[PDB]
């Protein structure tokens, strides 16, 4: 466990956009990028506004009904086909999504800490993997009431996730 997330600390850069060109099709490697930087924006504009309540403060107070927490289950949903379009496979083994998601949330919570330049204990890897966790159990569980239009849109996007990762193809 302490091994594997020290493992990913070395590793938080092979989700990178240079370490992950070439290694998954240009459509799902754009998607990355959008979403990586749309889910960054959205923390930074929050964080700025709760520090400037209270500049002393060190945890960021994850808003379950907000934009920032529905561009979160979005860039877990293109994590997931970045994770599947690596291993060339549909269907990782437990070990290697186990893997994956300590690298993800590694990642994410470094760029919190360098990009957004916020106290390391605001946007830890507990409180990510919590949220993880939810998305990894499903929209329905994540967001706690979906109306069923809303779950609709969420399979179609997965779903075009998905056929960019294939290089376009089912």
Request: aromatic content about 10%; proline content about 4%.
């Amino acid at each position: 466990t302490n091994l594997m997330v020290s493992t990913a600390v070395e590793k938080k850069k092979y989700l990178d956009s240079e370490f992950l060109l070439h290694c998954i099709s240009a459509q799902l490697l754009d998607m990355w990028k959008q979403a990586r930087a749309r889910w960054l924006e959205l923390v930074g504009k929050e964080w700025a506004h709760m520090l400037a309540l209270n500049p002393e403060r060190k945890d960021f107070l994850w808003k379950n009904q907000s934009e920032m927490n529905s561009a979160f289950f979005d860039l877990c949903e293109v994590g997931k086909q970045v994770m599947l379009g690596l291993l060339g496979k549909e269907v990782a083994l437990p070990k290697e999504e186990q893997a994956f998601w300590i690298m993800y949330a590694v990642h994410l919570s470094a760029a919190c800490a360098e990009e957004l330049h916020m106290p390391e204990v605001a946007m830890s890897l507990r409180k990510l993997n919590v949220k993880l966790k939810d998305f990894n159990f499903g929209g329905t569980r994540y967001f706690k009431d979906m109306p069923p239009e809303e779950k609709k849109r969420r399979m179609e996007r997965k779903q075009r996730i998905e056929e960019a990762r294939r290089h376009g193809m089912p």
